[PDB]
């Protein structure tokens, strides 16, 4: 008296046109494949934009067994959406969450289990052009003249290989601490999701992960390698639709010895090729 769903692919990723095939294992029963875009209302930023409501991507139900031992039964769905409705990338965000789930339920006089399968956006048409960016973290980067006076004199030079990043490829670059009067306690990368909901409109920025790249007083003139692996389901290609936007930024924050923090923001543009 127990159910389980086994999706054929180990990685459980399926593209916008493939076929979702698997086996349901037991020890009448139906199975429903539902994809949802859950948008969570937030603190107002700008008529209260009361259009932030769940969006159903896909709805498909199969009556699998009409009303012992280890039993297995195959199943399959076609991943198709009319002619213009796109299957959004799986995205475990905070205010925008795009999730595809299979739900198997068996009636009794009802045992249910939900298993999530990932959907990957189709590769772009393809003219991938990296956009290398050079930057200089200086005391003239903090957006306050009042605090800037207490900042020790520092100068860091860096080069991001591309702000237009392939999501399967890591963010690579170099950072050279040309000269810092105060000892550098830590330099870390901070991937910040920028999620927007509604129209003329709630916009939030939330940290996904922090990855420290420089610990302690690094040699002055040594190229510390900026390396960052994008998280699997917490990052998606930059998505824009009339109801919601999901963008991504990276914040290089330098920490100095007397608890001083300096932020440089680079808006990335993730894509799949």
């Amino acid at each position: 008296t127990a159910l389980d769903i086994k999706i054929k692919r180990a990685n459980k990723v399926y593209h916008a046109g493939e076929v979702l095939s698997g086996v349901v294992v037991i020890s009448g029963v139906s199975l429903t494949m539902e994809g949802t875009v859950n948008l969570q209302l937030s603190a107002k930023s700008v008529a209260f934009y009361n259009s932030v409501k769940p969006i159903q991507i896909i709805n498909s139900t199969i009556e699998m067994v009409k009303p012992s031992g280890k039993t297995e039964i195959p199943f399959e769905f076609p991943l198709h959406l009319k002619g213009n409705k796109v299957l959004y990338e799986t995205y475990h965000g905070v205010f925008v969450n795009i999730q595809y789930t299979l739900r198997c339920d068996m009636k009794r006089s009802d045992l249910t289990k939900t298993c999530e399968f990932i959907v990957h956006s189709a590769p772009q048409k393809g003219k991938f052009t990296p956009s290398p960016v050079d930057f200089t973290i200086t005391p003239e980067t903090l957006q306050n003249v009042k605090e800037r006076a207490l900042l020790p004199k520092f100068l860091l030079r860096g080069h991001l290989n591309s702000t237009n990043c392939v999501i399967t490829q890591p963010l690579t670059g170099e950072l050279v601490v040309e000269s810092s009067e105060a000892a550098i306690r830590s330099v870390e990368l901070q991937l910040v999701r920028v999620e927007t909901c509604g129209c003329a409109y709630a916009r939030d920025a939330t940290e996904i992960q922090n990855i420290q790249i420089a610990d302690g007083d690094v040699c002055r003139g040594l190229s510390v390698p900026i390396y960052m692996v994008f998280p699997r389901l917490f990052t998606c290609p930059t998505l824009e639709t009339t109801n919601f936007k999901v963008e991504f930024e990276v914040n290089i924050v330098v920490l100095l010895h007397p608890d001083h923090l300096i932020t440089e923001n680079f808006p990335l543009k993730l894509c799949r090729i």
């Binding site: 420290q212 610990d215 040699c219």
Partner: protein, 802 residues
């Protein structure tokens, strides 16, 4: 039973008739006797030294996820508990807990609260990482059996989880731990991940943490992909880029805050640079080693770097470039890493590979000019132990003498000996290892004063055993150079004075073997008198050890017989006194012995060697003394530490004594069969065991002896001693007395046989009867009617009871 008659025996005629004809062999006639590899030192060994040396008594703190005031042993116990928790969590299908435990353990490596404990700490925590690295790998391998999609998915999940780690040092350590798993993602995964980790190490700002991280990365690379050396060279180059930070301002301020002096902060670095350089220089081309050498030279306070350059590079490279390394050592700053450590490393290199011929004298001179200026005795001996090997291997006895004199000069003042008993032993061993001929080793003037240095008892005696082993195994001919004798005499004295009541028997055996090895090799040529002088001074010198006395007795008897053979038996007036002196020497010497059966046997051998020189009186004294010693034999004796009966040994001793007294003449002032008569009295009076019948065996032996001696001519004779066959000339009275003794012995044997028959022990009675019949067949004249009847009766009695 019945009287005895001796069958006539013609030994010469019987031997001639029974002798087998033999055909000699000319030349050409056929006779059978005609004519990463083993060169790579693994991290497992270095684990022990790093853990042993780097121990701190300060209270440590292990903060996870808070614990304070922990000792080193409790710190090790807590790390072992963390490792066991890792293993239990993995075996319980809790992989996330395993990952978090490994992450925290790696986090511990980012803390430098107690600098002096960092090396050993690095050795402990890394073990957990290794335990992680294998334990993950097997799992994917367990899924493998270009692997299946499940193994690849698990490997990618692990790599993503590890790539999600925030702190840099934990991320690097955990990711390098599972570098092998990169095999499951692509054939180029390791070749694409190793350079990235090497570059990632640049983020570590603390020099010590970065250096040990580089060491771990090199270890993982060599135990995973040892064919990617081009990638790992970047570790050495980036390390040289970072080397400026070791003596920089930030580290100095950190040490000041922790209150740690630089002379103690620096020696924490070699454990990691040695590994880095060894991995990067393994089978490297000479061009790469050269380039590393000039890149190390061009820096600043590179005194530390040079050490690793000697500690890792092949011995040949450093040996050829040894003069340049001397030059580099010379300008090193004094306040930094010690110079004597660099000299020790260089000397260790020169102990394996020889330097160029033209430079050896300069190298030795410039090394000793710096070594002799050291003030601390301990590091001085650390250098001198290493460099004595070089001085003895390449140069002559004069330089060895100078080095030994310098060592004595340094260590004598402040009783430093106690701190360097082991090292000094090593030195002395080396001096003996390269000086085989002992006419040269003891020509070294300060060799004996060096032995005088070891004023402890246990330490000194071991060096003496080493000297004596070297002498016995490197001296194939007798020597006489008085320098040799006096020196080995002193060594044997100072080794024999260690024998006391507490000394074990095995130690006495080993010491006796060594002093015997010395004594055997002193041969005074034809000067027999001075050889006896050596033997008397030896007995006075080596009194305590019994086997030395035994060997001395044997050797003085050997000298007596050697004089006999040299002079062809024709003893001279001058040499009669010498042989009498030797035999009197032996007479004095035996009684001192402790063992009993040894005393008896040596008394006999002394007797026989005594009669060989026509000197009869003291020989009779020997036999009388042996007889008087006979009753002291115990029933139960000691053999090889165990306890064994003394029955058969007593039988064989008496048998030998009888066979000897066959030839011994009887003094005219006394009666016939004299010594035989007292031996018979003793054996009859001996407290023989009730369940023992070897006594009648000995009476049968008595019958054999008297029958043999009743013959006209004895079987064997001494060179110039008139035995009873020639002394009495087969006199009728002597034969009658012998026959009366025969009747007495046979009456005793028959009485014993009757007692055995009355005792109902028929097996022993039958054996006795059969043996007596065999004896009668041997010697008893069967022609005589009474003796033949007695033999027939004995045979019938033996066959009656089987």
């Amino acid at each position: 039973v019945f009287p005895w008659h001796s069958r006539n025996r013609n030994y010469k005629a019987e031997f001639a008739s029974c002798r087998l004809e033999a055909v000699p062999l000319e030349f050409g006639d056929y006779h059978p006797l005609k004519p990463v590899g083993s060169d790579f030192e693994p991290w497992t060994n270095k684990r022990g030294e790093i853990l042993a040396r780097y121990t701190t008594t300060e209270k440590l703190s292990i903060n996870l996820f808070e614990l304070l005031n922990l000792t080193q042993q409790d710190y090790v116990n807590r790390i072992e508990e963390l490792n066991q928790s890792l293993k239990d969590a993995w075996a319980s299908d809790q992989k996330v807990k395993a990952l978090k435990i490994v992450i925290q353990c790696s986090k511990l490596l980012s803390d430098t609260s107690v600098i002096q404990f960092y090396p050993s700490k690095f050795v402990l925590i890394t073990d957990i990482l290794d335990t992680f690295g294998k334990l993950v790998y097997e799992r994917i391998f367990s899924m493998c059996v270009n692997a299946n999609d499940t193994a690849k998915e698990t490997c990618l999940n692990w790599f993503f989880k590890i790539a999600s780690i925030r702190e840099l040092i934990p991320r690097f350590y955990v990711e390098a731990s599972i570098l092998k798993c990169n095999k499951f993602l692509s054939k180029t995964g390791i070749s694409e991940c190793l350079p990235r980790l090497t570059c990632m190490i640049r983020g570590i700002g603390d020099p010590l943490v970065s250096v040990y991280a580089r060491a771990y990365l090199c270890r993982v690379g060599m135990e995973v992909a040892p064919h990617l050396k081009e990638t790992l060279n970047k570790n050495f180059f980036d390390f040289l880029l970072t080397f400026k930070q070791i003596h920089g301002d930030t580290v100095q301020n950190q040490l000041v805050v922790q209150g740690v002096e630089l002379p103690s902060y620096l020696p924490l670095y070699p454990p990691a640079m040695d590994w880095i350089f060894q991995c990067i220089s393994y089978h490297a081309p000479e061009a790469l080693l050269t380039e590393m050498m000039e890149r190390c030279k061009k820096l600043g306070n590179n005194a530390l770097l040079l050490n690793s350059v000697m500690s890792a590079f092949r011995a040949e490279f450093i040996a050829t470039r040894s003069m340049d390394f001397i030059g580099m050592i010379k300008e090193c700053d004094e306040s930094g890493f010690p110079k004597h450590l660099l000299f020790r490393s260089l000397g260790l290199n020169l102990a394996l590979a020889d330097p160029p011929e033209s430079d050896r004298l300069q190298i030795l001179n410039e090394a000793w000019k710096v070594i002799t200026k050291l003030k601390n005795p301990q590091d001085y001996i650390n250098c001198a132990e290493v460099w004595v090997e070089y001085t003895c291997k390449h140069f002559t006895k004069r330089e060895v003498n100078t080095v030994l004199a310098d060592v004595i000069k340094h260590m004598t003042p402040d009783r430093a000996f106690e701190d360097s008993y082991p090292q000094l032993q090593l030195i002395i061993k080396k001096v003996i290892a390269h000086f085989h001929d002992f006419s040269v080793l003891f020509s070294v003037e300060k060799f004996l004063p060096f032995l005088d240095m070891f004023q402890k008892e246990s330490v000194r005696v071991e060096v003496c055993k080493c000297i004596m082993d070297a002498f016995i195994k490197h001296q194939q001919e007798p020597t006489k150079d008085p320098v040799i004798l006096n020196a080995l005499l002193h060594v044997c004295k100072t080794m024999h004075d260690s024998v006391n009541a507490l000394t074990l028997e095995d130690e006495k055996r080993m010491l006796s073997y060594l002093i015997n090895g010395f004594i055997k090799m002193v041969s005074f040529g034809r000067d027999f008198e001075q050889q006896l002088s050596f033997y008397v001074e030896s007995r006075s010198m080596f009194c305590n050890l019994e086997p030395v006395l035994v060997q001395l007795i044997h050797s003085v008897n050997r000298l007596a017989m050697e004089t006999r053979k040299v002079m062809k038996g024709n003893h001279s007036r001058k040499t009669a006194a010498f042989v009498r002196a030797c035999v009197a020497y032996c007479f004095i010497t035996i009684p001192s012995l402790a063992g009993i059966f040894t005393r008896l046997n040596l008394y006999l051998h002394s007797g026989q060697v005594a009669l060989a020189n026509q000197c009869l009186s003291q020989a009779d004294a020997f036999f009388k003394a042996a007889i008087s010693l006979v009753p002291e034999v115990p029933k139960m004796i000691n053999i090889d530490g165990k306890m064994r009966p003394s029955e058969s040994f007593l039988l064989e001793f008496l048998c030998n004594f009888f066979s000897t007294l066959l030839i011994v003449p009887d003094h005219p002032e006394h009666g016939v069969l004299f010594l035989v008569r007292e031996l018979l009295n003793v054996i009859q009076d001996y407290t023989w065991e009730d369940n023992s019948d070897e006594k009648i065996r000995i009476y049968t032996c008595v019958l054999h002896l008297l029958s043999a001696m009743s013959q006209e001519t004895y079987l064997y004779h001494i060179d110039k001693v008139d035995s009873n066959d020639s002394l009495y000339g087969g006199d009728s009275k002597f034969l009658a007395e012998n026959n009366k003794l025969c009747e007495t012995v046979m009456a005793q044997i028959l009485e014993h046989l009757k007692t055995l028959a009355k005792d109902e022990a028929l097996k022993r009675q039958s054996s006795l009867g059969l043996s007596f019949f065999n004896s009668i067949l041997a010697h008893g004249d069967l022609r005589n009617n009474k003796l033949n009847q007695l033999s027939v009766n004995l045979w019938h009695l033996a066959q009656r009871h089987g």
